[PDB]
Design a binder for this molecule. Structure first.
Ligand SMILES: COc1cccc(CNC(=O)c2nc3sccc3c(=O)[nH]2)c1
Ligand SMILES: [Ca+2]
Ligand SMILES: [Ca+2]
Ligand code: NA
Ligand SMILES: [Zn+2]
Ligand SMILES: [Zn+2]
Length: 168
């Protein structure tokens, strides 16, 4: 027999993602680099592996949309809600949606796509919000060079998946 696991988490270390569509605001290359870097934030401190799929069904389906886009969490035009992601599980579980009424960037202007993606993928992997105002998983977006994952987020993600190689 098997009872349900104690916490919501992926039951496998190999996860896939798919960039289903793209924002007008950035090049395909810029978007791909931002998401790759965002996944690496989490794979660096766990035993998780992320593989990109070009088509078909991936664990983490990524998309840009506006207003009603196929779930119970419609976006709201410019400002307000920015993005959301579902916790680990089947179907919409793990998926990450970005409001394409926001301005997405690879700079300090608008919303930095890498930074928001890194936060969203935290939710995709099973982290809820943190009370630490310096944490990646803090509820409110603020945005320097060279990103470093704060310790609160490292402890959180490692409570779910372990550290993987502690010196890779
Ligand atoms: C959609 O809600 C979101 C989206 C993204 C981030 C957040 C909250 N986290 C931050 O804003 C943040 N974390 C870190 S971790 C190292 C630097 C920084 C930084 O410059 N900002 C909330
Ligand atoms: Ca919005
Ligand atoms: Ca999914
Ligand atoms: Na946009
Ligand atoms: Zn959505
Ligand atoms: Zn959040």
């Amino acid at each position: 027999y098997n009872v349900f696991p104690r916490t919501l988490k992926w039951s496998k270390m190999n996860l896939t993602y798919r960039i289903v569509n793209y924002t007008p605001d950035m090049t395909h290359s810029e978007v791909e680099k931002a998401f790759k870097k965002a996944f690496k934030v989490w794979s660096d401190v766990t035993p998780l592996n992320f593989t990109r799929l070009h088509d078909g069904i991936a664990d983490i389906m990524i998309s840009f949309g506006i207003k009603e886009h196929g779930d119970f969490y419609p976006f709201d035009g410019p400002s307000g809600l920015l993005a959301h992601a579902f916790p680990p599980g089947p179907n919409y579980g793990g998926d990450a949606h970005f409001d394409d009424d926001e301005t997405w960037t690879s700079s300090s202007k608008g919303y930095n796509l890498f930074l928001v993606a890194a936060h969203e993928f935290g939710h995709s992997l099973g982290l809820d919000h943190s009370k630490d105002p310096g944490a990646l998983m803090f509820p409110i977006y603020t945005y320097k060079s060279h990103f470093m994952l704060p310790d609160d987020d490292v402890q959180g993600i490692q409570s779910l998946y372990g550290p993987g190689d502690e010196d890779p």
